[PDB]
Amino acid sequence: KLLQILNVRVVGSGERVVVLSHGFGTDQSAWSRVLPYLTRDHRVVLYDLVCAGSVNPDHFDFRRYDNLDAYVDDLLAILDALRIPRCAFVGHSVSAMIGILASIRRPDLFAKLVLIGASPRFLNDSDYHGGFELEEIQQVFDAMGANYSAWATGYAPLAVGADVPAAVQEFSRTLFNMRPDISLHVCQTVFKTDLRGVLGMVRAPCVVVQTTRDVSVPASVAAYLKAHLGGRTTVEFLQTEGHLPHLSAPSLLAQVLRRALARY
């Protein structure tokens, strides 16, 4: 059931497998523009997180998906159902956290991680800059609960960051496709997640994709990830602004993805 439930699609050709895992407010269609740069050389696995608007809301279990380990379970179950013992994994935002956790759970399964819009912790801590004070994100959660449409309209251009109207429109499309209570819930789950303690346990090589400015990811986070991840970690600097380079700068991003996924 799982493969149909999370809209799993496998495209491309080859024995080298790459998983593309999207972030909050999008579904797998967010990968559509970078996808042609990968499918000649790779077998590409796409799926929707259970919280995506493109997934039947009937399947969203608030109790089960109260932590990211439940999302990791879905990812591993998909790869097991597809009989894929080794892959590269590209994760955006919450999916970068899912990827880190998954690579610790199953080290031999993930040959390489590519992390986009990525952070081990979005809340500030003493001297650790995550990007948000507790009070800041609580204000966001208040706004999301009070009027989701109004909040979403305001957030979309901030997330896209660069002045790219088409990307703002497209991100807004899938952001509005989410049921507001599910949206709030997944955001809360992300903001109570703290992977700093386990970064040292990762052994997979890792590419961290950094843009010039990300409303949710301070510039210092990439070097922090490089410093504390336990595998070989390279920061790739993308010369463009925003949290969603696969939507707003797919050309810049695809060439980095090509390099990162050429061999693993």
- Give the resolution value in Å: 1.5
Distance CA 246, CA 118 (A): 13
Strand partners, 112: 88
Distance CA 87, CA 84 (A): 7
Backbone angles phi, psi at 214, to 5 degrees: -140, 120
Asked if residues 261 and 184 have their Cβ atoms less than 8 Å apart, the reply is no
Annotated binding site: 93, 187, 243
Q: Of 230, 240, 176, which is closest to residue 210 (Cα–Cα)?
A: 240
Asked if residues 96 and 104 have their Cβ atoms less than 8 Å apart, the reply is no
3-state secondary structure of 50: coil
**Catalytic position from the list 214, 216, 246, 248:** 214
- Cα 13 versus chain centre, distance: 24
Taken in order 75, 115, 53, 25, the sign of the CA dihedral is: positive
The identity of residue 113, as a single letter, is L
Active site residue 243: yes
Structure tokens belonging to residue 184: 């709030």
Taken in order 102, 66, 95, 71, the sign of the CA dihedral is: positive
Distance CA 2, CA 71 (A): 12
Distance CA 101, CA 74 (A): 12
**Catalytic position from the list 21, 29, 93, 103:** 93
Asked if residues 93 and 23 have their Cβ atoms less than 8 Å apart, the reply is yes
Annotated binding site for substrate: 93, 187, 243
Distance CA 159, CA 245 (A): 10
3-state secondary structure of 3: helix
Asked if residues 177 and 54 have their Cβ atoms less than 8 Å apart, the reply is yes
Structure-solving method: X-ray
Structure tokens belonging to residue 250: 């797919």
Angle at CA of residue 141, ends 140 and 143, nearest 5°: 65
Instruction: Write out the DSSP string of 91-120.
Output: EETHHHHHHHHHHHH-TTTEEEEEEES--S
The identity of residue 249, as a single letter, is A
Distance CA 236, CA 261 (A): 13
Sheet of 110-116: strand order equals 9-12, 43-47, 17-21, 87-92, 110-116, 206-210, 233-237
Asked if residues 51 and 60 have their Cβ atoms less than 8 Å apart, the reply is yes
Distance CA 192, CA 182 (A): 15
**Catalytic position from the list 95, 243, 246, 248:** 243
Q: Which CATH architecture has domain 1-264?
A: 3-Layer(aba) Sandwich (3.40)
Who's near 162: CB < 8 A, 6+ residues apart?
Answer: 240, 241, 242, 248, 249
Asked if residues 252 and 239 have their Cβ atoms less than 8 Å apart, the reply is yes
